[PDB]
Design an enzyme around this catalytic site. Structure first.
Site, PDB file in Angstrom:
ATOM      1  N   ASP A   1       0.830  -1.206   0.000  1.00 45.35           N
ATOM      2  CA  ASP A   1       0.000   0.000   0.000  1.00 45.35           C
ATOM      3  C   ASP A   1       0.865   1.256   0.000  1.00 45.35           C
ATOM      4  O   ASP A   1       1.364   1.676   1.048  1.00 45.35           O
ATOM      5  CB  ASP A   1      -0.893  -0.002   1.242  1.00 45.35           C
ATOM      6  CG  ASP A   1      -1.797   1.214   1.320  1.00 45.35           C
ATOM      7  OD1 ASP A   1      -1.912   1.930   0.309  1.00 45.35           O
ATOM      8  OD2 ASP A   1      -2.403   1.431   2.404  1.00 45.35           O
TER       9      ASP A   1
ATOM     10  N   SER B   1      -0.665  15.458 -12.124  1.00 52.69           N
ATOM     11  CA  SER B   1      -0.921  15.097 -13.502  1.00 52.69           C
ATOM     12  C   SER B   1      -1.154  16.353 -14.328  1.00 52.69           C
ATOM     13  O   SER B   1      -1.696  17.334 -13.837  1.00 52.69           O
ATOM     14  CB  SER B   1      -2.146  14.177 -13.571  1.00 52.69           C
ATOM     15  OG  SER B   1      -2.526  13.908 -14.906  1.00 52.69           O
TER      16      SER B   1
END
Length: 330
Positions: free
Chosen positions: A35, A199
């Site tokens: 994770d 992004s």
């Protein structure tokens, strides 16, 4: 040194991925959920409330000659999906794919929430976010990666998650045969303890690319792709019959649909998520309404590039002095 381990979807939907991890001496192999959005290595154990164990493999520290109780240490964590667990702490030897750390903090669960109990395939979590998020008290502990880093050939790990198929976590090296083209690196902020990056935009299907900054986290422990409501609405508008359902808890769509792809930007590069990656199947057994793999982050407080996004790429988690993230097509 290096390590390399195969990671395997837990079910037919790729709801999560499990990777075998050796703990203790002799080795006790547990299948952990790696994770990159958390920083605790915790396991079901011989100390876990019995009614809360349902098919998981447990760590039994008393059977490990290298286990030592970390005196006074406890831990307690709550995850973004509402699940939680807590307990005490041992140090022990932990190996992943041939890479060994001695003295790793292994957080033994005394209590786990129902969602963990109900998932027989996940024996615990191995956190790979920054150690500043580790919940051990009163002395915070380091992640497996943090402990291994100085010994690694290169201070990196990579995630290569499969779509409906096994994939690979590598530590200490970049497998140049595992991706196509080049790896595009992008800046990371560690201020919130995550692999947080920005992004450069998105496209829906064959549509034009929208240049827009989307801050979010690379999170292998989250199944879906959570993005701003504007982006998510633009995606689902291209699927006839798709709608956001408050009763279900997100966007659903007719299971008869052909889903469009979703592209996200990494610098000037583009990662394409095929439409099929966005299908999470019937909302309930036998339903013709299917759950979408792209959902709104509104009310999460952060955008999350979870498995839906990451499995479309070869992803480098570069733990150099100034960390960065790399993405390649594959």
């Amino acid at each position: 040194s290096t390590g390399s381990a195969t990671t395997t979807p837990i079910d037919s939907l790729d709801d999560a991925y499990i990777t075998p991890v050796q703990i203790g001496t002799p080795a006790q192999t547990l299948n952990l959920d790696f994770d990159t959005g958390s920083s605790d290595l915790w396991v079901f154990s011989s100390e876990t409330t019995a009614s809360e164990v349902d098919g998981q493999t447990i760590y039994t520290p008393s059977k490990s000659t290298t286990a030592k109780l970390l005196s006074g240490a406890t831990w307690s964590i709550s995850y973004g999906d509402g699940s939680s667990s807590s307990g005490d702490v041992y140090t022990d030897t932990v190996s992943v794919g041939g890479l060994t750390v001695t003295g790793q903090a292994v957080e033994s669960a005394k209590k786990v929430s129902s969602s963990f109990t109900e998932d027989s395939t996940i024996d615990g979590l191995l956190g790979l976010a920054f150690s500043t998020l580790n919940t051990v008290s009163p002395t915070q502990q380091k992640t497996f990666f943090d402990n291994a880093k100085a010994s690694l050939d290169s201070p990196v790990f990579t995630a290569d998650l499969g779509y409906h198929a096994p994939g690979t976590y590598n530590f200490g090296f970049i497998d140049t045969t595992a991706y196509t083209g080049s790896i595009t690196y992008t800046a990371v902020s560690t201020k919130q303890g995550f692999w947080e990056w920005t992004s450069t935009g998105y496209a829906v299907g064959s549509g034009t690319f929208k240049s827009t900054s989307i801050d979010g986290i690379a999170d292998t422990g989250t199944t879906l792709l959570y993005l701003p409501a504007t982006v998510v609405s633009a995606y689902w508008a291209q699927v006839s019959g798709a709608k956001s359902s408050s009763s279900v808890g997100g966007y659903v769509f007719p299971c008869s649909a052909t889903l469009p792809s979703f592209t996200f930007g990494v610098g000037s590069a583009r990662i394409v998520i095929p439409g099929d990656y966005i299908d999470f199947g019937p909302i309930s057994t036998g339903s013709s309404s299917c759950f979408g793999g792209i959902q709104s982050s509104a009310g999460i407080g952060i955008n999350i590039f979870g498995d839906v996004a990451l499995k479309a790429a070869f992803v480098v988690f570069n733990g150099a002095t100034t960390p960065t993230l790399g993405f390649a097509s594959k």
